[PDB]
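Second attempt. The first submission of Genome polyprotein had a stray character pasted in from the spreadsheet, which I only caught after the job came back as garbage. Lesson logged: always re-copy from the clean sequence file. Corrected sequence (456 aa) follows.
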Amino acid sequence: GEIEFIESSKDAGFPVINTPSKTKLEPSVFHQVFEGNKEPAVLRSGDPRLKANFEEAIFSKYIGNVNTHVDEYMLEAVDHYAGQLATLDISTEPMKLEDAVYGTEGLEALDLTTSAGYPYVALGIKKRDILSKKTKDLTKLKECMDKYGLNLPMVTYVKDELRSIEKVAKGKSRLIEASSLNDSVAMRQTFGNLYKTFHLNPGVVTGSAVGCDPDLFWSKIPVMLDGHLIAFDYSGYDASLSPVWFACLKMILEKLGYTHKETNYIDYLCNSHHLYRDKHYFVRGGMPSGCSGTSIFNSMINNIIIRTLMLKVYKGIDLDQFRMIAYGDDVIASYPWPIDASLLAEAGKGYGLIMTPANEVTWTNVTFLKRYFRADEQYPFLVHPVMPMKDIHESIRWTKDPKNTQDHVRSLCLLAWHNGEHEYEEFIRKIRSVPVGRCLTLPAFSTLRRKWLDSF
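This time the job returned cleanly.
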């Protein structure tokens, strides 16, 4: 992706977008009891922790585009992945408006807490002024979509989240895009059935883990990926994507039965208009992370990319024995023969991608969704997802709202006990060394283990 044009919003008649300048993350009551290095991402240019130019840093992920046609390797990759997806019988019929907005099996209701985007943010109109969970009203939404239409600018926000010392100092805060409510809804109508099928079928047919529950899904992954493991993620995947990969995605969608007109929303993702505080800018290429479907579309594109690279480097590869699962840029995969991931990574560089491979990827050292894999000692066909304790420690030391401490700590307990009973008891011990910790309902190790075993 590449920023092609930027200027002052006022020159085009856009008002300034007022985004909060200060982090909501503050040290929790557990900040001293546990160790950690992460701090809130820089959100503003004058942050005294910066050791770089902030606005240059946050936009540096738009590294450019490789301009190329859809080549022979891409064409075969698309065909192979389309054949997989064809077995799922994805409906290209529009999802009905009430299901796409207020919820249905496989597609959670539209998030009422996030930005409604443009022009609503400039008018003070929030999602809850238009939509109602209790009444499921669609009348105001129909008014607003009729009035303002589709293909509206996106609103860029800096993501408020913990980051490492290096990413704080370099100002490399992540950006999230808010599609207009109108565009979010229209995309959920257009693609909602595809979204549902992906959410309900994580694994090696969708090639997707989006929406998975690691507590359940981790045990299935080694059944599916039974060859030599291949794994990697990327640096700045979303913004690195060149338009050719969006062309590949459009070809895949059309093979699934979407009309050319129905794939027009992919052009909306690829060639985009953004408002950021007092500026507005146009981007060619790059997935605008935060718009409807970007995790699923990123994952679908990644399925095309990896196949493309394998076909290009390993002429005579048999993709029917290749298996892969992606969550956005994150990939875990297998093939019955060893594959040199560094060759794939260098081939990806030729397509404008920055891939970072996982020396002998094993079930001991492979990661996916920032978690390890550890087979249960007693039930060896069940596999624990293992979030490192250091990451749990990083999270517990901060809070965006201490009123949610109970929910926060309980969520972390659900992750921590997979590290073993000794680690969990120590975690609980330290929690209880603060008075708040003795006011919390904390699950017992044996209870978490029993409930996990019984969930299968």
